Amino acid sequence: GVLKIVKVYLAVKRRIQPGDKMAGRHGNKGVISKINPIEDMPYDENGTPV
Amino acid sequence: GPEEITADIPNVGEAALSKLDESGIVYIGAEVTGGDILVGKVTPKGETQLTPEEKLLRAIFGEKASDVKDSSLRVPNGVSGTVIDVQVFTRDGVEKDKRA
Amino acid sequence: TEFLKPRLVDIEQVSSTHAKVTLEPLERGFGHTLGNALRRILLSSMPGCAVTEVEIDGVLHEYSTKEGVQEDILEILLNLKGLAVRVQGKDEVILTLNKSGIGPVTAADITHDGDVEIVKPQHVICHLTDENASISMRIKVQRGRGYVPASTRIHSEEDERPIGRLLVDACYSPVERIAYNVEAARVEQRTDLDKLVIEMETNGTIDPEEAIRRAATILAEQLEAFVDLR
Amino acid sequence: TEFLKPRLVDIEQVSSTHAKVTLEPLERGFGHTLGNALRRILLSSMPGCA
Amino acid sequence: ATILAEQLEAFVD
Amino acid sequence: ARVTVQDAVEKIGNRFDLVLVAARRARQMQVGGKDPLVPEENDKTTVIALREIEEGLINNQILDVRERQEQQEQE
Amino acid sequence: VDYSGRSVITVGPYLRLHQCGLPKKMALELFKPFIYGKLELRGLATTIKAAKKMVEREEAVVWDILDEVIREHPVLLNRAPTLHRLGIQAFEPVLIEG
Amino acid sequence: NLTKEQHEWLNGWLELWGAWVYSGRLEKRMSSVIAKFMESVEPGRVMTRPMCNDDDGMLISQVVDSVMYIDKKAFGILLSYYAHGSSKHAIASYYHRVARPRKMLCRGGGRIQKPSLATCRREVDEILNASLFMIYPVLDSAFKNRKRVEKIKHVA
Amino acid sequence: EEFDAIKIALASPDMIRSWSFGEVKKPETINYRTFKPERDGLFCARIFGPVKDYECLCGKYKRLKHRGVICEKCGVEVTQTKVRR
Amino acid sequence: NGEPIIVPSQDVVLGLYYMTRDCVNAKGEGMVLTGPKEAERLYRSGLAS
Amino acid sequence: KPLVGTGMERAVAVDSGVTAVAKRGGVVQYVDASRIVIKVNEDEMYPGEAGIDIYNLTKYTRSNQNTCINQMPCVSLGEPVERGDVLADGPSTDLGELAL
Ligand SMILES: [Zn+2]
């Protein structure tokens, strides 16, 4: 009872946002609560932001 | 009657069929959104089989529409992204189309 | 009211990108204030030019694979997002990159116009492998500030978008890293003055003196609403 | 390339020497810059007699 | 704000 | 009445009686379209009725004799 | 139970004690017949089908009407397993983007 | 008033809009899964009504919103004529049912009475003719001043 | 709809015959050519009410104008389809 | 039990412990202040820890 | 790659059956984004065959958990690789090390 079958593949691209889960390798999982700008992040004496 | 895949979808406009070709299948690379028609499929609501009495009267008059109920494949809501592959399998016996 | 005014004194470029620029003299308690304010403005809101659309020939979507190139087309779009360019006159140009034969496709092979200067002629984009291979992309460079992603652009695009325009995300700001220093200024009659040494590190496109003057222009324009209306 | 000029909408004078100077809207990441600059200048640079 | 504008007054457009 | 309904609770004497009295007042404001005795300041009818109880105009027996007054003035 | 949503929870420390940040799309899906009522009251939609399609097209007047509807209209934040009675609390929602 | 081909074009578009509005009401009759199988194996002799493509529906809804919002009675008569599918005689008899006695000054010495079916049919016909005459030119202009979105294009 | 008590008890055969609307006498539920329910079956329209809102099985009575009647052709009482449960 | 459950938990607690703890000779020990506002002014100016 | 690893990442990336290790060593003749054509060394070649291995790479195949599976090559054109070297990095590999 099936004549023809069409299969469509959609390739979504999923950037991170507030809410996305993240984890390390040592059981320290977490959830992204905010995306904080580069001017607000803490920088060291050389200038590289965290 | 069989469900035909075609771009002759009734009661729908250019805002949904701007990405389909003449065969009723979305172009590879066309970025679709939620609610957009991917594969244009329509189920017959009347009849397709005929008798020889209706064959001679078909040569007299013609046809009807008989394509009321539309069950085209649409994208689920929230899903987006570009089509990357369309694979159209068919059965041995059914004639294919231009996209196939 | 015993205030003193600062001036741009020395601008030394250690490299073509890294460029340390001083500021002298400043009163006690103003070096850290002005240094932090100028650092935040220069990291947030510096206008620059970046690649926004890329139209490779014979390529529909970004997840395809062209015959002849070694890099995937997503890797080509990432290498083109990492491109640094400086448009002089206009605000919206269209570049062209034609290259055949065996060898890498550097950034210097882009057929630039009369007012578009590429700053990094070693930025390797592709790796052509076949002798019959060819690539002809039509890169589009816009002008703006901030980070405008492809999702925001397809939300703000009410007109149609054709098939072939591989939409590259836009990182417009040309300042990647910046840190100031509040040293002890050398003034012959005052020992309580502090100089500011801003150790900028740009993309190679912007001028550091133009960046500091534009940052102070933005800060003075924002403080006009504090001076005027109460 | 033009920024977003704020408009002073509220000065809620609590007392004879109090204020709540609400100033909206600013660009993303400019309220902290203006607030920290004004706070440091007012705490350690404003002249007066004592 | 007048003090900060007067300090920034030098390197403007 | 926006952040805390505490003084309305001390005026009434019962949380559940406060819910019932404010429900009848909010029904009179939503169905009949009566006049709120307080400035509404672009609030919803729940917060307006709770503010009326917060001031102390609305009580069970007071709203009942007022409804009885409107009923006997209807007849 | 209808008129119900579900999402991951994050931290908002800029809030007050009686507030929670609902997303824009999820609360639009939650408060949909309330948006229908305010659309037909303000005269921006003649019929229920016109109001349905104006919400489904996500217009700027729909977002303004949703900002007016969700103001001072508390929602219950439940989390399973609700062991004790403080696992259900009512918060005045504040619309956030996310 | 209008001509006949203009009336035919406007009545076709308004009938499509009425069947589009009637496909969104709340109260509707329920059919179980066995009724759906019977309708899928042997359907009725008459099929359903055609709908708009939802953009023409929204545009005609905005046009009647711009014109017929000041008159509630004529807009209700228009909705009950084009969406519900009731005839003009049914609307006139339903108007005769809930008719209030109004002071007339045309026949006799100005007696008070309930108006009959003939004057009800006349006022329903006059309201429908005036409503269609008010809808037609701005609907023609709105169908004229709408950008025709074409098919997608290939750039390489 | 406003009841004070929910009384439970055993069920006499007279009470079970008073609950019912028709004796089910066939195991087969519905057909296979057209999917209408059978006569005295497990899904039968004459016993358990009509399938569609205000309609019989043969299609004679098809509106709310005939509010409640029994069809003389197929026995299906014209009511709402809520009485199938 | 009749105890508040809307309580600071682990991060507010670490911050308030680091606030109301006291060192021995940290920065600017042994002054006299006109009140809580001048104490907050001293810390945010940086002359006292 | 991870800056702090274990040395087990190479074993997992090779023996997971997800990359394209070289069966017989030699000199690579043609590197593409879709295939790798490698010319075998002389001593590891039987006289029956021609001695050219064509490693086709699956590009953007859907997995079970709806992620992508693509195989980018890491070897360059004209480079001698022996037997057992990772030629194409899989979905989450970087030069033969597991990179999650
Ligand atoms: Zn019947």
Closest partner residue to F46 among G16, G18, G72, by Cβ?
G72
- Asked if the peptide bond before residue C104 counts as cis, ω within 30 degrees of 0, the response is no
The answer to whether the Cβ–Cβ distance between D28 and A37 falls below 8 Å is yes
- Contact call for residues K33 and K73 (beta carbons, < 8 A): yes
* Measured distance CA(C121)–CA(H17) in Å, rounded: 62
Which residues neighbour J39 within 8 Å (Cβ) at sequence distance 6 or greater?
Answer: J33, J48
E strand or H helix that includes residue C137: strand C134-144
Residues paired with residue J37 on neighbouring β-strands, in sequence order: none
Check if C101 contacts K (Cβ < 8 Å). no
Backbone Cα Rg of chain C: 22
Number of domains in chain F: 1
Nearest residue to B10 (alpha-carbon basis) of B49, B47, B41: B41
**The domain that contains C210 carries what CATH number?**
3.30.1360.10
* Measured distance CA(C212)–CA(C197) in Å, rounded: 12
Phi, psi of G44 (to 5 degrees): -90, 0
Long-range Cβ contacts of A21-28 (<8 Å, 24+ apart): A21/G8
The answer to whether the Cβ–Cβ distance between J45 and D39 falls below 8 Å is no
Q: What is the dihedral of CA I11, I17, I18, I21, to 10 degrees?
A: 130
**The domain that contains K29 carries what CATH number?**
2.40.50.100
Same-domain check for residues C93 and C130: yes
Count of other CB atoms within 10 angstroms of residue A41:
11
Residues of A in contact with G7 (CB under 8 A): 19
Check if F33 contacts G (Cβ < 8 Å). no
* Measured distance CA(K53)–CA(K57) in Å, rounded: 13
Q: Which two tokens stand for residue K80?
A: 């001698």
Check if K3 contacts A (Cβ < 8 Å). no
Nearest residue to B72 (alpha-carbon basis) of B58, B92, B32, J38: B32
Q: Which two tokens stand for residue F37?
A: 């005795």
The answer to whether the Cβ–Cβ distance between D46 and E1 falls below 8 Å is no
CA E1 to each of CA C29, H62, J45: distance values in angstroms, whole numbers, following the listed order:
15, 51, 18
Question: HEC profile for chain D?
Answer: CCCCCCEEEEECCCCCCCCCEEEECCCCCCHHHHHHHHHHHHHHCCCCCC
Check if F38 contacts G (Cβ < 8 Å). no
- Contact call for residues B16 and B36 (beta carbons, < 8 A): yes
Same-domain check for residues C17 and C118: no
E strand or H helix that includes residue B37: strand B37-39
Residue carrying structure tokens 């609770």: F9
* Measured distance CA(C52)–CA(C86) in Å, rounded: 14
Domain encompassing residue K58? 18-92
Beta B37-39 vs K35-40: how paired, if at all? unpaired
Nearest residue to B86 (alpha-carbon basis) of B17, B26, B4: B26
H46 Cα–ligand 1 center, Å: 18
B48 Cα–ligand 1 center, Å: 28
Same-domain check for residues C79 and C146: yes
CA J37 to each of CA B46, D32, J30, J43: distance values in angstroms, whole numbers, following the listed order:
85, 21, 17, 10
* Measured distance CA(J37)–CA(K5) in Å, rounded: 52
Which residues neighbour K55 within 8 Å (Cβ) at sequence distance 6 or greater?
Answer: K20, K22, K35, K36, K37, K38, K87, K88
Same-domain check for residues C113 and C219: no
The answer to whether the Cβ–Cβ distance between G98 and A33 falls below 8 Å is no
Domain boundaries, given as residue ranges, for chain H = 1-153
Residues of H in contact with I36 (CB under 8 A): 34, 38
Same-domain check for residues C82 and C159: yes
Check if A32 contacts G (Cβ < 8 Å). yes
- Asked if the peptide bond before residue C6 counts as cis, ω within 30 degrees of 0, the response is no
Q: Which two tokens stand for residue K82?
A: 């022996």
Would you say the C-alpha torsion C115, C120, C121, C123 has a positive or negative sign?
negative
Q: Which two tokens stand for residue I42?
A: 């497990």
Counting as contact any 3 or more CB pairs under 8 A, the partners of I are H
CA B1 to each of CA A1, A47, B45, C80: distance values in angstroms, whole numbers, following the listed order:
11, 71, 8, 53
**The domain that contains F29 carries what CATH number?**
3.90.940.10
Residue of H nearest to I84 (CA): H32
Q: Which two tokens stand for residue B6?
A: 């075609």
Same-domain check for residues C110 and C181: no
Label residues B15-47 b or e (16+ Cβ within 10 Å = b).
Answer: ebbbbbbebbbbbbbbbbeeebbbbbbbeebee
Same-domain check for residues C120 and C144: yes
I18 Cα–ligand 1 center, Å: 25
CA K2 to each of CA A24, K74, K94, K100: distance values in angstroms, whole numbers, following the listed order:
11, 17, 10, 9
Check if F3 contacts G (Cβ < 8 Å). yes
Number of domains in chain B: 1
Domain encompassing residue B56? 1-94
Residues of A in contact with D28 (CB under 8 A): 37
Same-domain check for residues C101 and C198: no
DSSP calls for chain F:
--S--HHHHHHHS-HHHHHHHHHHHHHIIIII-PPPSS--TT--HHHHHHHHHHHT---HHHHHHHHHHHHHHH-
Residues paired with residue K55 on neighbouring β-strands, in sequence order: K36
- Contact call for residues H99 and H115 (beta carbons, < 8 A): yes
Q: What does the DSSP 8-state code read for residue H57?
A: H
Q: Which two tokens stand for residue B56?
A: 């001679």
Residues paired with residue C85 on neighbouring β-strands, in sequence order: C49, C118
Check if F43 contacts G (Cβ < 8 Å). yes
Residues of K in contact with A11 (CB under 8 A): 60, 68
Residues of K in contact with A9 (CB under 8 A): 62
Check if A16 contacts G (Cβ < 8 Å). no
* Nearest chain C Cα distance for residue A48, angstroms: 6
User: Residue I44 annotated as binding?
Assistant: no
The amino acid at F30: Q
Residues paired with residue C163 on neighbouring β-strands, in sequence order: H154
Helix axis angle, F15-27 to F45-55, nearest 10°: 120
Q: What does this entry list as its resolution, in Å?
A: 3.5
Helix, strand, coil % (nearest 5) of chain K?
Answer: 5, 35, 60
Which of these three, C148, C172, C196, is where a domain ends? C172
- Asked if the peptide bond before residue G81 counts as cis, ω within 30 degrees of 0, the response is yes
The answer to whether the Cβ–Cβ distance between C6 and E9 falls below 8 Å is no
Beta G88-96 vs G19-23: how paired, if at all? parallel
Residues of C in contact with H147 (CB under 8 A): none
Domain encompassing residue C153? 48-172
Q: Which two tokens stand for residue I23?
A: 């004796």
| CB-facing half-sphere around the CA of F71: CA atoms within 13 A | 6
Q: What does the DSSP 8-state code read for residue C109?
A: G
The amino acid at B99: R
